[PDB]
Amino acid sequence: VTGELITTVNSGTPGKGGEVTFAVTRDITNWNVTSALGNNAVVRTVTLPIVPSAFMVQPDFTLKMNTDLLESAELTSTDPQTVVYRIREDAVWSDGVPITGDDFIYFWKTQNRRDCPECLINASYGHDFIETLEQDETGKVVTATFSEPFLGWQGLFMFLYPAHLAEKHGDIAESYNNFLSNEVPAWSGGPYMVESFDPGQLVTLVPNPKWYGEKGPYLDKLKFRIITDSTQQLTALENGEVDVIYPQGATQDMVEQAAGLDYLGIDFQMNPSANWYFMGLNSKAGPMSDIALRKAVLTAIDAGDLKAKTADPYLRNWPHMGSVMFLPNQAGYADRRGARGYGTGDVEKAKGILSEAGYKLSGGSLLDPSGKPVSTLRLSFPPGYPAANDMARLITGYIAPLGLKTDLLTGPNATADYLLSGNFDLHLNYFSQQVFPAVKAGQIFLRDTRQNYFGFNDPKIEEIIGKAAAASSIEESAAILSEADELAMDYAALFPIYQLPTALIYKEAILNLRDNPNQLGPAYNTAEWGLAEL
């Protein structure tokens, strides 16, 4: 029995001074997390200490208004939808220039798909629904007027950049695509600022002397040590080369090794991630273009065994995920996977599905209805995730009694970004869930969207997602979106499995360091990090 909640784990009041080194698994070649080329957890983690945010995702997966930056953020009308931000008078950039509506307006123009068509952004996330964005004479009152209703307005302006500096480095596209992306940032609107960068080796941050927030900074230096071999991170922690690691693919062996390092003052936190494993099926081309084969495969897979073999030996009460739009703890979640018989390990039912669609078995091999042998299936998965490798082997075994063979494919070319309608039949990977399921769903289930890898193509799903994204609460949104989850599971192109475990492994002298098991991650509150007093 503990008195810590997910939001208060490892709370304390640190001393002043010292340093913390946090391992990251990518070199920094793009400093702009909102750009397509900078959109990953490493850039997000390294720049969270310097980028101000309107709202921040908390460990309980809620959005918290940043009261260091903002006095208030209010939905003041719905006819038309209007949001008013009041920026704190004391909020300033590291050169002393006030943070103002100039910074909101610049970011909106880079993200809204209209004012800067050449900006190489990741995604608009609804910034394009803001039609006008105006500020008062003081620069501290910002009014956003929307062209249509939008649920996820608190996810907007989560990363702000210094407009007055960007303005000195070309037009909007040039400053966003070059200055803010390619250059090591000399500026900050957060508790820390970059002092030096050794490419491929080390980012060194120091306190921002003009930090305006309530807490911190406590450290003389905050360092991010680049260790691209994720399997060497626990050794670096053991050896004192870093003080914190956050590896992506935890295993039983990793947990057991970390537990054996308690004599060095190492502890760890692990929680269900916003990242969730799935198997996608190529509905656009190849054998999986037949929905009957997709449903037979999903019915034959034994999800209980999948989890029993790869999670249950070292993770207690680990939840199945039976939705492709909601995590198990989100409003609207239900086991829509099992309701359809997917994941039940029911080989005889799967064989019936195939027989009833015209498939036949000959000499141990499945024949398609025309009489041609079904090809060996290409099952790809990215490197660096031992659980995915193990599950790929297990799935091969589950479908072998159907007369299907598989070729397992991995390595650097087997990532999601490199998927093509021509190069896979089955793909094991993960998606990163967002605070607003309807916003995430619009990025992955719509016909002409990059992350629709498996070929959903249903105007009704798209209509439902649009209505859900226009709702006035997450709960209403979830009630609407549930219908799209049902239809998506009917199509059998995306099979949810279970959430990845996080693993924050660290020297316990560091206080106010806690897991934040979502895309924003543990560096959401570096202003509070410090070392306990001896």
Numbering used by the authors: 31 to 564
Please give sentences taken from the publication describing this entry.
Soaking the crystals with EDTA lowered their symmetry from P43212 to P212121, thereby doubling the molecules in the asymmetric unit to two; however, no EDTA molecules could be placed unambiguously into the orthorhombic structure after refining the model with EDTA in the ligand-binding cleft. Instead, two sulfate ions from the ammonium sulfate in the crystallization solution were present in the cleft of EppA. For both structures, all but the first four N-terminal residues (Gln27 through Leu30) of the mature protein (Gln27 through Glu563) were visible, and the C-terminal His-tag from pET30a(+) was visible through its first three His residues. Based on the relatively weak (e.g., no large, hydrophobic intermolecular interfaces) crystallographic and non-crystallographic protein–protein interactions in both the P43212 and P212121 crystal lattices, EppA is monomeric, which we confirmed by calculating a molecular mass of 63 kDa for the single chromatographic peak observed by analytical size-exclusion chromatography. Due to the high ammonium sulfate concentrations (1 to 2 M) in all of the conditions that EppA crystallized in, sulfate ions occupied EppA’s binding cleft, preventing formation of an EppA–EDTA complex. When 100 mM EDTA was added to the crystals, it caused the crystals to melt. To determine EppA’s EDTA-binding mechanism, we resorted to molecular docking.
The EDTA transporter system is composed of a periplasmic binding protein, EppA, and a type I ABC-type importer consisting of a heterodimer of its transmembrane domain components, EppB and EppC, and a dimer of its nucleotide binding domain component, EppD. EppA binds free EDTA, but not metal–EDTA complexes, restricting the ability of Chelativorans sp. BNC1 to use only weak metal–EDTA complexes that can dissociate to free EDTA, making it imperative to determine the biophysical mechanism of EppA’s binding specificity before any improvements to its binding capabilities can be engineered. Based on its three-domain, bilobate structure, the β2β1β3βnβ4 configuration of the core β-sheet of Domain III, and the two-β-strand hinge, EppA is a Class II Cluster C periplasmic binding protein. In summary, EppA’s affinity for EDTA, EDDA, and EGTA, and its putative affinity for other APC chelators via molecular docking, suggests that it is a general binding protein for aminopolycarboxylates.
